[PDB]
């Protein structure tokens, strides 16, 4: 039995304040809390008060390619955005990808900290994180973030360009 974790997002409580973006980006600055930039947040709120839409979207896993088709939903009278539910770090939007580099972003539930900071800063209670055990064997090719970014840049620019550019910096 392994453990899976769940990000309980009640989008009906959300007020579109984007505090989650603030605190996430803050904590992920280098050093921590040095700067601040929602564009690098691992949580991005889909906000459109005119359509009464407020949907916290958490960064997911990485895909090198776009889908041949993108889905645009209409649910309960609401017209949602294209890919408006996708967690993927995708080469089609500026979401979940560094604004200056296009580097894959990815949420690790603040791995190391006592509690997720987005959860901690959402005062109204729109977010939470829970756990449970499963007998299903873990079959993930658990790849490290550095390796993911490395292979992303290698796929984007070249397996030799990265080597030569890194060599010219170290």
């Amino acid at each position: 039995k392994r453990i899976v974790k769940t990000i309980n997002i009640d989008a009906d409580k959300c007020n579109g304040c984007r505090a989650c973006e603030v605190i996430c980006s803050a904590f992920h600055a280098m050093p921590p809390y040095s700067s601040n930039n929602p564009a690098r947040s691992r949580v991005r709120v889909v906000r459109d008060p005119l359509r009464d839409i407020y949907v916290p979207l958490y960064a997911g896993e990485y895909t090198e390619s776009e889908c041949i088709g993108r889905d645009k939903f209409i649910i309960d009278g609401k017209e949602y955005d294209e890919c408006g539910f996708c967690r993927a770090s995708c080469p089609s939007r500026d979401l979940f990808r560094e604004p200056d580099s296009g580097l894959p972003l990815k949420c690790d539930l603040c791995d190391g900290e006592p509690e997720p900071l987005c959860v901690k800063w959402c005062l109204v209670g729109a977010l939470s994180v829970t756990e449970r055990e499963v007998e299903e064997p873990d079959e993930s090719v658990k790849r490290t973030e550095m390796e993911i970014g490395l292979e992303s840049l290698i796929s984007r620019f070249g397996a030799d360009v990265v080597a030569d550019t890194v060599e010219q910096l170290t």
Partner: protein
Amino acid sequence: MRYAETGYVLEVDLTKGSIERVATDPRDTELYLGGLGTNAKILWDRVPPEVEPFSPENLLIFAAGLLCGTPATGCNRTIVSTVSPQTKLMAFSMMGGFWAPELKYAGYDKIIFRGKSPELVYLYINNDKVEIRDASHLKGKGAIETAEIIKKELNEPRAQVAAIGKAGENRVFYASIEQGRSSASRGGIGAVMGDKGLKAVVVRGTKDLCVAKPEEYIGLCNEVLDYIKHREENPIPDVMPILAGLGSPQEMKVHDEKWHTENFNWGNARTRRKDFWTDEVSHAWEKTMDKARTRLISCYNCPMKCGATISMEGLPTYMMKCFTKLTYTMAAYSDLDFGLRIAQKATEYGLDGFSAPQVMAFAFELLEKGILKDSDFPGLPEGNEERFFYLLDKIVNRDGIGDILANGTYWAAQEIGNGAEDYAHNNIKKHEQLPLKLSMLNPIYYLMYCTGEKINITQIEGQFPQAPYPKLEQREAFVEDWIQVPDEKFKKIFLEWEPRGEKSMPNFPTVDMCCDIVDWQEMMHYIDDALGQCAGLSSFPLKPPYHIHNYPKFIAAGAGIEMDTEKLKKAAKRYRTLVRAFNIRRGMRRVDEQPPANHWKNRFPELEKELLDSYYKLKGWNDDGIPTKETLDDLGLGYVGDEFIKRGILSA
């Protein structure tokens, strides 16, 4: 390197069509903090008193507060500054939402607009890419509508847009600037924006914003959050709900509209209805509100969600907060339904929700008395509500009588004549006030009404309670944990204050006490309006998480400059007296600092004079309301004094 602020601004000449990024002076940051302060510094030595509000020389400034873009909860305000076409004085106006932090993320602290574009255009900002786009296809469009169209065009769904409606284009003296659930409302800055040919300002920012001392700053933030939680778990006891919690007046959240509909003055700040709030009215309003309130929403980085989306049947959704919910209703003697419906039109048009219904009610009073004839209202419908919609459209188009009313109650009355001045009875310095006419004189509010540069009573009051407690135990329990007070005396004062007796108003608190109170409250407001912090978490409510004790820590750890309590006090005093000086240079004197004649039923001239004198003395001003050469020298504003003497405003 620079912290919290970006260190740059944008100079835009709309006539020449020129755009330039300019570094700022860190000394200006150490002297005037930022936002309103540095705005005032810019206007001072770039806009001489000979400049007209609708002249190319006039400046339109969009300022993002110092701590905007930092993790500080609620710090997201934009401060727009120019020369008001109504008051002919300085106009600064605050808007919340998401615009200012977006500008900070774009890497700018201010945008300074000069000259006039002959063709209707807008400004597109995206980090380092800045350009002027043609906006002739947006002529007449509503503010929100414009924002949406532009965002579709530029393919920037996450861009923040501040725009004017039709009223802004037609230079209505109370035209506003709108951005989502946020409005730069009073002053007529929308009129200046339109006059320069600027339809909108569109900003998209994706750069980082650094602070000096990270862990300390975020610790301060965490402290603020914890205090917010505690404050929400413990409201101010024995006080009506809307005056017990944090944030802007929670008019959107369900409360008891009894105190509101029976204290505010209906019509043209005229009629007071002592028994209006019947059960029927209450249930009807509750029903309308339950049906229309889609969601409570927040500004950037805040959990208070003071705003609300409003969706009336057959109408586009818009957003609303605070007393805009009541005014349009009260001015028309109607219901909440009508108010909500017309507020949609008004919001899309870009109109100050304070002045506009007062203007319309004023006009209808003139029609009633006979000063204005039916001939002045071409095709005036029979129904009341219909008459208000009609007049609204007439005003935003400047059509016929609308052309006159668009100038505000003062300038309308002066142009109409035949005793029209008597009906413009709610102005101060040509600026309409809250439709509130109390009975017994209030010393504190007398001073505030008289001297406040915003010329708006709600944007200067806050830190000291509006009313005293009946019992003493309540006062003791309240002053127990009152940590926000600068000096302990403020507790003692509130301990002695009573509803009735020899320790009540207007004789108590004493003149000096009242002066101290007004000084404090105003100071907190000026600090907020410099830092970009929302008044909803500081100057406006009781016992806020932002006060005079922790603010210097915030400015220190955030901007990386030396700052303590006294230095901050002196700074606030500095750019406040600077704004004062600017207004003095444009002709304002003690003469102009008087409340409406009928503002109170019980007036006390000998008390009022002593109040005003003592307050002038405490601020370090003349008996005429002018800052003395000495106090100017002390506040590092020697150049101001030199110019004052050189112009003959002061004697050498």
